[PDB]
């Protein structure tokens, strides 16, 4: 099974480790992002067939899909909370905390995806196969071998569908319902990327260099 496989490759629980203003909040998220960026990359290589792609294509996918995969981590962690965003198990933002630190509009955007996933009652197994699917479905304009990337997409999609066609056969077309959240996923990731590039430009906030490198690709 690819799901059991992709599942135990996921990192273990993350903990925030950060003048208590807006500039200290952004830094905590920016370094939580950079720390998980590092872990996506470790995790990506466990996706079957991902490492058999040419390195340029592995980078093209990651460069397109990285924020989508982070957002899906925040979403998964946030499912049990009452309109809270858990960037980490340590670090759980609400509306007022968000608004003060300038993150309100981003906060509302992610919460919309959170509330959609709460109603779908998405499981850890589905988050994992969906993270993988967002990676292979990134739509990078810089892929050299579209056919190999499509094969991966077909594989991850098969997995998601065959996982659903048994573990959750009580609910029909539950696969498609999860796929139908992907546009909002990409949309929300677009808002996060612009906001975080907006604090990149401002310069008042420091960013570990892997995070910065991903942000300028976008």
């Amino acid at each position: 099974k690819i799901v059991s496989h992709l599942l135990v490759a996921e990192p273990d629980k993350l903990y925030a480790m950060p003048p208590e203003g807006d500039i200290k909040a952004l830094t905590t998220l920016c370094d939580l992002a950079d720390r998980e960026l590092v872990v996506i990359i470790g995790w990506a290589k466990h996706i079957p067939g991902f490492s058999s792609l040419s390195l340029g294509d592995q980078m093209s996918l990651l460069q397109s899909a990285w924020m989508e995969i982070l957002i899906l981590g925040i979403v998964y962690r946030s499912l049990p909370y009452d309109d809270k965003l858990v960037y980490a198990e340590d670090y759980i933002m609400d509306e007022e905390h968000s608004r003060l630190a300038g993150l309100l509009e981003l906060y509302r955007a992610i919460l919309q995806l959170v509330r959609r996933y709460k109603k779908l009652k998405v499981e850890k197994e589905e988050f994992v196969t969906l993270k993988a699917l967002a990676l292979a479905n990134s739509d990078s304009m810089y892929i050299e071998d579209l056919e190999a990337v499509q094969k991966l997409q077909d594989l991850l999609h098969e997995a998601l569908q065959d996982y659903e066609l048994s573990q959750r056969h009580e609910e029909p077309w539950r696969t498609g319902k999860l796929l139908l959240t992907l546009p909002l996923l990409r949309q929300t990731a677009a808002k996060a990327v612009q906001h975080f590039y907006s604090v990149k430009l401002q310069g008042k906030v420091p960013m570990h260099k892997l995070f910065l490198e991903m942000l300028e690709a976008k």
Partner: peptide
């Protein structure tokens, strides 16, 4: 030269 390729081939 990129951090990404560093982390991708570690």
């Amino acid at each position: 030269a990129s951090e990404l390729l560093k982390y991708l081939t570690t």
